């Protein structure tokens, strides 16, 4: 499809709601979404990161994440266009699929 | 376990500073940025380090962006560096140089 395109106001309006519904928020002074995750222990946390990592490979899109033991803070944004794109939404949805099937 | 003494810092930190580790200015911890070929390598690195972190029961404060991995080490139980930080750092260097 060429290079990613920053989401249009129409797209944002129809794709962001489901993600804010479950904790994602837009960062201030930057076009990106973020969410803090908490698990039982580092092991779970890294199992989570590992699964997400494998999907990140299939998508060729990677997260901006920070990990401290059982916490994993994730920030998503597309560098090519300096903002949110399908990719971010795509990866976020998969991340929710995983962070939910571990409760 | 316990916070390193001025004597221990003097005999354990040098080898790590030699290869890039630095002390934070304002917090008792060491830091170092790592860069790799791609995310895959980067995550392979983090995975190996993660397994050792489990054996040590000591974990890093790390941030990853694609091929970059910034690591900060410190021990919360004693408010500062400890044998565990130095131990983990040394293992991290073995893996990074192994790259």
């Amino acid at each position: 499809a060429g290079k990613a395109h920053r989401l249009s106001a129409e797209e944002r309006d129809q794709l962001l709601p489901n993600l804010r519904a479950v904790g994602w928020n837009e960062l201030e002074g930057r076009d990106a979404i973020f969410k803090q995750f908490h698990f039982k222990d580092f092991n779970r946390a890294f199992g989570f990161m590992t699964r997400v990592a494998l999907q990140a490979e299939k998508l060729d899109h990677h997260p901006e994440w920070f990990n401290v033991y059982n916490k994993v803070h994730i920030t998503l944004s597309t560098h090519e266009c300096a903002g949110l794109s399908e990719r971010d939404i795509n990866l976020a949805s998969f991340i929710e699929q995983v962070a939910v099937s571990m409760t | 376990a316990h916070r390193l003494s001025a004597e221990e810092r003097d005999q354990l930190l040098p080898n790590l500073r030699a290869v890039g580790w630095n002390e934070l200015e304002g917090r008792d911890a060491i830091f170092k940025q790592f860069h790799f070929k791609d995310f895959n390598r980067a995550f392979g690195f983090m995975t190996r380090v993660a397994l050792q972190a489990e054996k040590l029961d000591h974990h890093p404060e790390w941030f990853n962006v694609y091929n970059k991995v910034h690591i900060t080490l410190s021990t919360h139980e004693c408010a500062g560096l400890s044998e565990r930080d130095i131990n983990l750092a040394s293992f991290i260097e073995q893996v990074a140089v192994s790259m």
Partner: peptide, 27 residues
């Protein structure tokens, strides 16, 4: 296996990787 090594294996399968193709690639 340690708790973490299990996670890595688990996730390694759930990524759509049959134990077969895994054991094969292994060894």
């Amino acid at each position: 296996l340690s708790q973490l090594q299990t996670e890595l294996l688990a996730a390694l399968l759930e990524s759509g990787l049959s134990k077969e193709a895994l054991i094969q690639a292994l060894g």
